[model samples]
Target chain A: TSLFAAIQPYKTHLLRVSPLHRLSIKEYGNPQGKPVVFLHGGPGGGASDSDARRFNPTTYRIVLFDQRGSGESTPASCLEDNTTQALVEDIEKIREFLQVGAAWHVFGGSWGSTLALAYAQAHPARVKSLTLRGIFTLRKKELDFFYQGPGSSFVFPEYWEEYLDPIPVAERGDMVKAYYERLTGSDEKVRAEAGRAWSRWEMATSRLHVDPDYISKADAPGFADAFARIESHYFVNGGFMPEGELLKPENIAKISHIPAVIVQGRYDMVCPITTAYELTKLWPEAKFVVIPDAGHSAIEAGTEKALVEATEEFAKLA
Target chain B: MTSLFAAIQPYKTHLLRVSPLHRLSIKEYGNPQGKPVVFLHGGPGGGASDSDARRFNPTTYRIVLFDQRGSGESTPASCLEDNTTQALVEDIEKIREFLQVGAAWHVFGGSWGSTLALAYAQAHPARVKSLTLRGIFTLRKKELDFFYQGPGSSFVFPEYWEEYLDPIPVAERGDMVKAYYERLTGSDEKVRAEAGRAWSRWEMATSRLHVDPDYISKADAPGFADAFARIESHYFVNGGFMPEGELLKPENIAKISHIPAVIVQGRYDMVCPITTAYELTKLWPEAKFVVIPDAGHSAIEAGTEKALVEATEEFAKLA
Candidate 1:
């Protein structure tokens, strides 16, 4: 519902920005149409093949890519030189490389939504408009909701229990750090299990109704290691910014001038809908679209339907 | 992902006919010469798994697990006749006598097992050497409401609560157990099955901090849903066949005051919450209380499973 039918990548590039990172970028949709850069979530979560299908291929020029140390990026899952600053710079490089224009539409979801916000705030003039979903601000409360407990646990306590399985009883006080140690550890077994559990927890809660069969599918060692380790590195290191940097009035003020459409799911437990509400309150001009009966995943029925429509609606602004 | 102790196969099995209509399926594991411990399975109808014996050292203890009347391998499954909390308590006495334990034997249980253990212990205090419990369930109205009606678990999974309410009309919603009782005991087996799955899933959803939805399909197993749905609603509708505060009555609790007890509670157990465990420990003041930070009502959930293993080990020495 959220994406159009399968649209294959018309162009693919391996831009060698540095020895550590060769960012992977793809272009889809009509080349002569309005330009829009799609921001994928997960500091470590790689983009999907069909991510560009959300934009109308007839009217929008869609650009999607893997950030440093992520999907298809050179040395996949390598974190030696990865940082949020590097990621923001990578997006800028892609924009300049493509030469779409002085500004273009920004599309993202969840962590993608967080990154899109950051990218827009960084170079406000470069982002023509934004249509984001599953809003995540990376605030302390948001992190706590994901790891500390209460909000999400009240719903999917089983997944929460599994996530805490690796850490001991005493070390549960700092669950993130405990998980980080095992996720980034030298021991293959510990890393593998932690990676599965960490990946499983997200997979479980990504949908509205918890699917037991779906979440444990993280058996792929490569996917689990990259998904778990990269996400842990980003969260454990505080997303490499002062707390609430994205939400700071001064910071958000930078992007307030741009037209934006935020498509959020009311049932998104992973990234609470509150982040989107607070953003709309700050930047009143931006459109706030809440997809009822949907969850954190953009693939959910309602979310997909509304996000597809929101993308087209924002395309009008472009 | 794995258990702490090796899983032991049952050394002996007996389906002792407890009544004209009921034969409790009981299994024994561990050393025949060691101290005996009776494990009460939960669900009013929640049956036992083979893994129930892993909490204690087999060399040092005789682990006993039994399916209460109408549950697990019990005959005439889901027959409400001659079945009540009091009747199940009597069955425990019969099992105890049948085992021929001349002295006090250790009693262990979790969830509904915890409730049954408490009832059995209070009735015959000297018969219980010690009590080790997990996910304490008193079956009090408050505890029942927490997992059932509006002021409780419904706060979180409103959709689950909605599905639970689908079979009944709005008028009967106020008394879910009564309505469920009718459906469970109705002549139409199909209607009863529907009622059973709806009822069973809600309890399963609330039992663990995380759940195994994979097992929800087991509600359709031969007599599985009927036993769980019928026996549970029957007992709950009857207030577990005791007064509102009967289990916690100062007079009733005094009977088991001398029995050594160790209780482990899941901090987030939606079925039998931590509050009930806290109350039990306070009234029985001498009992040791262990609260697991991240668990639910399931004895198998990680923290509860570990705590239970630890509690049972300690009780084996001091018991």
Candidate 2:
């Protein structure tokens, strides 16, 4: 299956959710259609036009928005007052801003999967369905697998070496902490260099096959800067939640009745399959699709086909 | 992922003869024009029943099921003449030709069925559209030893192990497969029946997450028990009639590596250990690997059923 064709938002908003943050909200597709929101990955990875194509324009009132300091939101890369709890509220604010009466579908991948779970758990009554990919619960081990030793570093040793070049060996014991220091430091040049390296490593391992074109986005104007800084900020703060909060039994039970489809790449080194596999046991009612030939990137062919099928399936919901 | 697909009835059935000594009972279900798929049931002796048709969608698949030699309702019941892994592989091709299937067909199997599926797909890769295997068993020396010999599965299933040992004398316990094979193929009808019942019962005891009283009782039926144990012993004693680790060989795997495949394994499977499936994935990275967290070796287990049905549903599009 292919994604829906390219689309442009009919309306846009820059709503102030907190004293320091204003979110960039873009509404596309049919105005009278059932509402569905697209949460982009990277605490800083903003929404793209392709994200809107995941839905059917004829049936869904598609919503795309950048989280607190990411994407087109004001105070680019700012870390203050930005947390998982704040992002959960931002989703509710967007629902109310659009004046949607009925519960709407929630869609997310990567960091977006983290945010989608948080939002659904916090406001179960407002979410009708969840379509998730490359699930990340912001757990300590989940973060450690991608950043620290004995994990993704072993799979992509060459690329990981470049990721390690930014920090010295002495400080390499904690890559996330070491990068956090540089991303938040006073020196402008040091931050940009650290940001590019951090973003580069992600683009390197996100696909089953290495794609040079996708990796080039690591150097795209303003992408790496906000992407690295905001992502590090959230990781350092543990997504602003207690450990394993999103996957807690009580939290999962809140939205257990809501329809959900979890599409995960069997070889997703970044988020790995353990979290999604465990989540299925906790919530057996949710449909789980493991694409054997894909990785963490939703843009991968197998992952994309599954996600599109999920959206089309959910479009049939009343 | 919720439950097995809705109940289904066969639209066509055939008693196919691939050889003068053996005949196969074959059944076809679902759309005649739909994508073709051949389902291989487990146990080598396990027969195709009405419920097996529910795995695939009636509207989307031309589902085919067959009973291997000496099993199911096939003629010369319990006869093991000309039965070997190579013969079974050829039988599948004969079925494809007899049915006049123009395009490649998807092959679905579990346990021993997975062993035959791998053999058939490797022999004729172009004839396979997709492969969905669960509870993978390749019939290597270690796999046979693990289930039949002491100091393996017996540790986990000690109580059932005692019953399995009751049929074989203490002197022949060193090589349990051979011990069971001797009596399973022995001349005395009374001795053979008793040994067959015990061998079949042992498999049923540890096949699922927990002991299923209903499933284990299937061994009490003389017809099913005799065929299941006799054929299983014949195949195991002959080492599947192929070289050691033939299915796991690099050359054979390369032949079917490009086919869309999914390997579903239970995290706690005792009959067919997870190590075999894990090793296969390492060599065939292109195939999807699904590890069911709470499942055992049975396809009927909730998690394994969900994974298997989901694979078929996804492959319906490819077909």
Highest-TM-score candidate: 1
Error of 2 at A117 (Å): 0.4
Task: State the displacement of the C-alpha of residue B203, model 1, in Å, after optimal TM-score superposition.
Answer: 1.6
**Chain A TM-scores, all candidates?**
0.96, 0.98
Task: List candidate 2 segments past 4 Å from native.
Answer: B1-319
**Highest lDDT against the true fold, candidate:** 2
lDDT by residue (tens digit), candidate 2, A109-193? 9999999999999899999899999989988878986887545664455678899999999999999999999999999999999
Which residue ranges in model 1 land beyond 4 Å of their true spot? A1-318, B1-3
Task: Evaluate model 1: give its TM-score.
Answer: 0.55
Which number leads on DockQ?
Answer: 1
Per-model lDDT? 0.80, 0.87
lDDT over C-alpha atoms for residue A17 of model 2: 89
Q: What residue pairs are clashing in model 2?
A: A292-B288
